[PDB]
Design a protein around this ligand. Structure first.
Ligand code: HEC
Ligand code: HEC
Ligand code: HEC
Ligand code: HEC
Ligand code: HEC
Ligand code: HEC
Ligand code: HEC
Ligand code: HEC
Ligand code: HEC
Ligand code: HEC
Ligand code: HEC
Ligand code: HEC
Ligand code: HEC
Ligand code: HEC
Length: 503
């Protein structure tokens, strides 16, 4: 179980290896060289104040130069160590002990990233001094390339994840993500270490061991990370540069409570999966090569993505307090439900306006329109006064093998409501007083007087073919299914008499 394994194979670049690649355990090496009184410089060279992540060179010049670099420096240390009686590595004649095919695995490595709590601990840190702003420390970490001064500069309000510009491999001036991260994070972690203030880790396991990550202090006291995003955004059906038509849209546009969404999410990137910007710069109505022709409709409504409005919302719906109802019902895809998001802009018919004219507005003007949209929504409707519903229901129309079932209708509804508690997805998407009722009274209008299940679930007569569930099967599927999705302990589905006593 290691998080610090590296497979050394730089040579493959120049041709097929004669021998296996060389497993190397970096934390085993660093533990040992520190104890010998040495540091990173024992194996990495520097230039311009920057440590190279490569072993004992600035460049991969030839096959022959790397092979000599490794043997001469890797072995040389193992030799001196053995000649001194210390614990050590493979010696010069031990080819297969370095060049070893077997290491199947034993890798526990894991990606690391900044959630909002870990990003705050860096901002709020006194060892990371402000720069270019009396109060702000953003420029200690974030940059953009300034063509004018031919150099990196802190772009105020242009901060983004490193992933937005640093990818899988280098793109000539900008390093790939791993070297970016390893160069910036570790080197500051080591400066701050010299002043014995609190710091971040430098051992590989320290960032990459699952156990280490679990140990990090987490903070739910997280202030708004604030570059200059809007509180209220106006999302639009964007046609895109290359579209024969330039067609408006088909729906009304959608105001979006950006500030509230921030406070509920874990970072920015979950939504802005490529870079902070609109979504429409790439996901247009018809899609674009920048999305990979993934169209705006897929981006905003896709059922199983955490990135989309519908998709993220779908995962909140699996939480037990919700899933009783949400695992049973089907969607109406009704115009009222679409209209929870697609609303009227104040003062005009957005459908008669091209995207461009709204995108071209100044951010503060567009925010004001969305805000007005947001503010005009209908207040939460709530459900019926539970006193207008039967406190108890006895279900006995097919009683036989057992007595009829006495069921605590009203108490169960209050608990559903209590479990929903303050959740705002539910308060706004539960659009009719009887919406909650439809969690069990499916397929009929929201109402104080829903019909009985028998009104349309066959009496109990077909052992073989029966269009949707007969009566008994529908009660059992509804009652027992909710109890399991909600993790209700009692009654238990095996406890027949707890829902209907015998006789
Ligand atoms: C997380 C906040 C980030 C880290 C850590 C780094 N970046 Fe960047 N970066 C960007 C460009 C265009 C370059 C090339 C600059 C040039 O033309 O010389 C870089 C370079 C780096 C480097 C190399 C430093 C060196 O002198 O060799 C490091 C270590 C690095 N970046 C770390 C651009 C961007 C960017 C575009 C918007 C973002 C979001 C980031 N970098 C984020 C991070
Ligand atoms: C002092 C504590 C350090 C720090 C901060 C780093 N190392 Fe090393 N390192 C060594 C070797 C053989 C490699 C593989 C590169 C190659 O073969 O050319 C590395 C690599 C790294 C990385 C990159 C990790 C990755 O796989 O992406 C990093 C971030 C790194 N080093 C930092 C060898 C050694 C040593 C030889 C005994 C010593 C000592 C160190 N490294 C020390 C450090
Ligand atoms: C015992 C004498 C040998 C022999 C015959 C070879 N090695 Fe090594 N070697 C080491 C490392 C890290 C490399 C680079 C790995 C890579 O980038 O792929 C090498 C390289 C080689 C090569 C060239 C690559 C190839 O497979 O063609 C060859 C032919 C080679 N070695 C032969 C490291 C070590 C050791 C670490 C201490 C030890 C011991 C050895 N090598 C020993 C030998
Ligand atoms: C000590 C030498 C190591 C070694 C061997 C590795 N890491 Fe790191 N690393 C860090 C971050 C932020 C990234 C970007 C990817 C991510 O977000 O987790 C990486 C990337 C790597 C890779 C590349 C994996 C890939 O397939 O893209 C590898 C092999 C890797 N690391 C190994 C963060 C850290 C640390 C934060 C302080 C430190 C310490 C390390 N890594 C150290 C090492
Ligand atoms: C000063 C207050 C700021 C502001 C306004 C921002 N940062 Fe950071 N930031 C840092 C790193 C390593 C990341 C990448 C995290 C990852 O991919 O795991 C970020 C990310 C951001 C974002 C996008 C947030 C996201 O969802 O990923 C934004 C909008 C942002 N930053 C703004 C690193 C640092 C620092 C290093 C110690 C510090 C200081 C800052 N950032 C400071 C700020
Ligand atoms: C795509 C851009 C959208 C749109 C149009 C909406 N969301 Fe979300 N949402 C999420 C969570 C956790 C909640 C409840 C928050 C709380 O309890 O305070 C919500 C709530 C809403 C609402 C109701 C409140 C409101 O702002 O009006 C609405 C109308 C709404 N959402 C619209 C979570 C997410 C996501 C998780 C990653 C993502 C993606 C989205 N929402 C995306 C969208
Ligand atoms: C334990 C596994 C059992 C067994 C053997 C049965 N049930 Fe139930 N059942 C429930 C409800 C609300 C009804 C409708 C009652 C009515 O309209 O009279 C039923 C119906 C049945 C029947 C058919 C009716 C009859 O009496 O013949 C049978 C044979 C039956 N059940 C067997 C509800 C529940 C539960 C509530 C969640 C639980 C638990 C069970 N039943 C468990 C069992
Ligand atoms: C939201 C406030 C409501 C309202 C207004 C009602 N219910 Fe229910 N209810 C449920 C079941 C399984 C039955 C028995 C149906 C049958 O046996 O055919 C009932 C019964 C009712 C009635 C009586 C209807 C009748 O004519 O007998 C009424 C007026 C009624 N309900 C209103 C189950 C549930 C739920 C399961 C968890 C939930 C939620 C609700 N009901 C919610 C509501
Ligand atoms: C009284 C509350 C009930 C109960 C307990 C159930 N129904 Fe219905 N139902 C109806 C139709 C047309 C179907 C076919 C499937 C569908 O269209 O959703 C169903 C299906 C069910 C199931 C099975 C669901 C599954 O996902 O496999 C169950 C457990 C169930 N129902 C229970 C139609 C209606 C009504 C039409 C007006 C009425 C009223 C009810 N059902 C009432 C109830
Ligand atoms: C001293 C400066 C070292 C240099 C440079 C390299 N290695 Fe090493 N190595 C060193 C020590 C003190 C040890 C033993 C560590 C321990 O805790 O036992 C090692 C060990 C290895 C091993 C053996 C792996 C194992 O026993 O579990 C290998 C395969 C190894 N070293 C490879 C290796 C390579 C490939 C190096 C250059 C890349 C290298 N070592 C340099 C000390 C030093
Ligand atoms: C200075 C400019 C830093 C850079 C850039 C990065 N880190 Fe950092 N980190 C720094 C400090 C001063 C601290 C201690 C903060 C405190 O007061 O608690 C940290 C802490 C971390 C931690 C905490 C680990 C823990 O023990 O809980 C982690 C995991 C961490 N830093 C990771 C990290 C990464 C991945 C970075 C680049 C992507 C990075 N840090 C940059 C200082 C600085
Ligand atoms: C939030 C949870 C949404 C719900 C529910 C629905 N839509 Fe949606 N849709 C949403 C956003 C943020 C967007 C992008 C903004 C815009 O108005 O363009 C969309 C976009 C569409 C589109 C494509 C553009 C257009 O045709 O106007 C379509 C066709 C669309 N929306 C249709 C649609 C329907 C039919 C819905 C109910 C069934 C519906 N959306 C719900 C966000 C949300
Ligand atoms: C280019 C700069 C984009 C921006 C801006 C946004 N998205 Fe994207 N998206 C992009 C690509 C290239 C892809 C496919 C490649 C990939 O990463 O999958 C996507 C895909 C999506 C999806 C579908 C996910 C799936 O499982 O296939 C969604 C739901 C999505 N994108 C949402 C989305 C949102 C909400 C954006 C603004 C916050 C956004 N994207 C911007 C490219 C780009
Ligand atoms: C039964 C009592 C319910 C519980 C408990 C919760 N929801 Fe619900 N919800 C219910 C119904 C009958 C509907 C109507 C479905 C339709 O499409 O007409 C809904 C609707 C929603 C929706 C949006 C519609 C959808 O996209 O599925 C959302 C986003 C929603 N509800 C959220 C939500 C959450 C977060 C809940 C737990 C907190 C929750 N609902 C509970 C019935 C019931």
């Amino acid at each position: 179980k290691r998080a610090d394994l590296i497979e050394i194979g730089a040579m493959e670049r120049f041709g097929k290896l004669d021998l296996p690649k060389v497993a190397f355990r970096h934390d085993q090496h660093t533990t040992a060289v520190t104890g010998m009184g040495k540091d990173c410089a024992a194996c990495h060279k520097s230039k311009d104040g920057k440590m190279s992540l490569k072993f004992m060179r600035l460049d991969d010049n030839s096959a022959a130069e790397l092979k000599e670099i490794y043997h001469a420096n890797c072995i040389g240390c193992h030799t001196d160590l053995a000649k001194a009686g210390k614990k050590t590595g493979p010696q010069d004649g031990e080819c297969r002990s370095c060049h070893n095919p077997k290491p199947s695995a034993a890798s526990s490595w894991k990606e690391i990233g900044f959630d909002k709590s870990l990003h705050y601990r860096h901002v709020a840190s006194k060892a990371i001094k402000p720069v270019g702003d009396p109060q702000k420390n953003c420029g200690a970490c974030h940059h953009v390339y300034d063509e004018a001064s031919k150099k990196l500069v802190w772009g105020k309000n242009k901060e983004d994840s490193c992933r937005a510009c640093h990818g899988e491999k280098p793109v000539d001036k900008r390093p790939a993500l791993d070297t970016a991260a390893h160069t910036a994070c570790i080197s500051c972690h080591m400066d701050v270490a010299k002043t014995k203030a609190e710091t971040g880790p430098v051992n590989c396991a320290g960032c990459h061991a699952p156990e280490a990550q679990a140990k990090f202090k987490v903070v739910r006291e997280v202030p708004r990370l604030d570059r200059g995003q809007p509180d209220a955004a106006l999302i639009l059906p964007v046609p895109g540069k290359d579209a024969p038509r330039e067609m408006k849209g088909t729906m009304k546009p959608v105001a979006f409570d950006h500030k509230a969404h921030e406070a509920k999410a874990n970072d920015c990137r979950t939504c802005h999966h490529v870079r902070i910007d609109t979504c429409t710069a790439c996901h247009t109505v018809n899609g674009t090569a920048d999305s990979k022709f993934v169209q705006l409709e897929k981006a905003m409504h896709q059922p199983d993505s955490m990135r989309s409005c519908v998709g993220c919302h779908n995962t909140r719906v699996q939480q037990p307090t919700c899933a009783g109802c949400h695992g049973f019902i089907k969607p109406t895809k009704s115009d009222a439900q679409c209209g929870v998001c697609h609303v009227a802009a104040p003062g005009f018919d957005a459908k008669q306006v091209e995207a461009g004219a709204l995108l071209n507005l100044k951010a503060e003007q567009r925010s004001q329109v969305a805000a007005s949209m947001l503010s005009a929504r209908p207040q939460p409707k709530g459900t019926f006064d539970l006193n207008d519903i039967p406190e108890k229901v006895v279900i006995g129309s097919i009683a036989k093998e057992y007595q009829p079932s006495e069921f605590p209708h009203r108490k169960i509804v209050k608990t559903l409501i209590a479990g929903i508690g303050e959740d705002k997805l539910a308060a706004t998407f539960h659009i009719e007083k009887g919406t909650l009722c439809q969690g069990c009274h499916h397929n009929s209008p929201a109402s104080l007087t829903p019909p009985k299940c028998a009104s349309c679930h066959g009496k109990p007569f077909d052992a073989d073919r029966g269009d949707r569930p007969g009566l008994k099967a529908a009660y059992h599927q509804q009652c027992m299914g909710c109890h399991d999705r909600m993790k209700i302990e009692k009654p238990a589905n095996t406890a027949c008499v707890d829902c209907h006593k015998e006789r």
